[PDB]
């Protein structure tokens, strides 16, 4: 699974003393985060599960 | 990036924030996911 966003952390000193980490800017490969699954592997294992069922 | 594949999903929100100097406030901004925020009642 991947989140292709080289984003920054514009931390803001909303004290007193204590600090808050806000979201800076979002740059890079602006794509939606997603997961990669080996399809044949899933199909194969799922089948093995169905056998039990 | 036009037109719109990302659907935004984040808003360029700004607000008068209380700082270390409890007194004079500071207009700041931050990017939030629309899953975190909700419209009350730019907006």
């Amino acid at each position, epitope marked *: 699974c991947t989140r*292709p966003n*080289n984003n920054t952390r514009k931390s803001i000193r909303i004290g007193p003393g204590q600090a808050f980490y806000a979201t800076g*800017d979002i*740059i*890079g*490969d*602006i*794509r*939606q985060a997603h997961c990669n699954v080996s399809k044949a592997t899933w199909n194969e294992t799922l089948g093995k599960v169905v056998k039990q069922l | *990036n*036009i*037109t719109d*594949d990302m659907r935004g999903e984040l808003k360029n929100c700004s607000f008068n924030m209380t700082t270390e100097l409890r007194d004079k406030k500071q207009k700041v901004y931050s990017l939030f996911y629309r899953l975190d925020v909700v419209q009350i009642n730019n907006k």
Partner: single-chain antibody
Amino acid sequence: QVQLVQSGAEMKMPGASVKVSCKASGYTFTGNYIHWVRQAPGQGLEWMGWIAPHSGDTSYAQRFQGRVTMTGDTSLSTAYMELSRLRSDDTAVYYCARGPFPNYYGPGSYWGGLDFWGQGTLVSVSSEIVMTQSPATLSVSLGERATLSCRTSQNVAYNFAWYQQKPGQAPRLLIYEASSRATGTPARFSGSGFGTEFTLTISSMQSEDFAVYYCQQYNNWPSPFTFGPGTKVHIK
């Protein structure tokens, strides 16, 4: 908006070397791969290679690999290109160009096209060839439809793109993936094709449309990028 600004021009004889720089603004510089491409006089565009500033990985045209060096100074938001032992193939306007945004249904390098281009810097030595376009010139009146054709010496990945260029200005991307319209491009424009032959269409012409149009084949690899001679759409 996103902008790429380059260095100044030079004249060379074969055997000499040249270094050109490219400063980017408007986006996170490290986020996108930068291509180096050139366009010789009386000749079409040529791809030197690309560097990914994030990883530092690079790809060089086989033609280029020994002679060229691409560097990137991320603090500077600058990309550099240096080429020694100039030869004919060497002289042209040299352009840097950023790759496009990642696509939802894209295979690797599908976004390898040149999304945003610098104005280009001129260097002149000796001479180079590929894709073929027709007609050389297309005279039309605002309102008519324009059709442009591109014949390739090789078949393609469906990684075919068209660019619009008013001379003296940076080239601009019209269509990508043979038929996907670039953001900000009007419905008027459409593209299609397969194999060796591809075409671009403008349903109804507008005055803004007059410019030169070029086709390009792009991929992951060194030899993979190739461009056509260009077709001029002139008003009349």
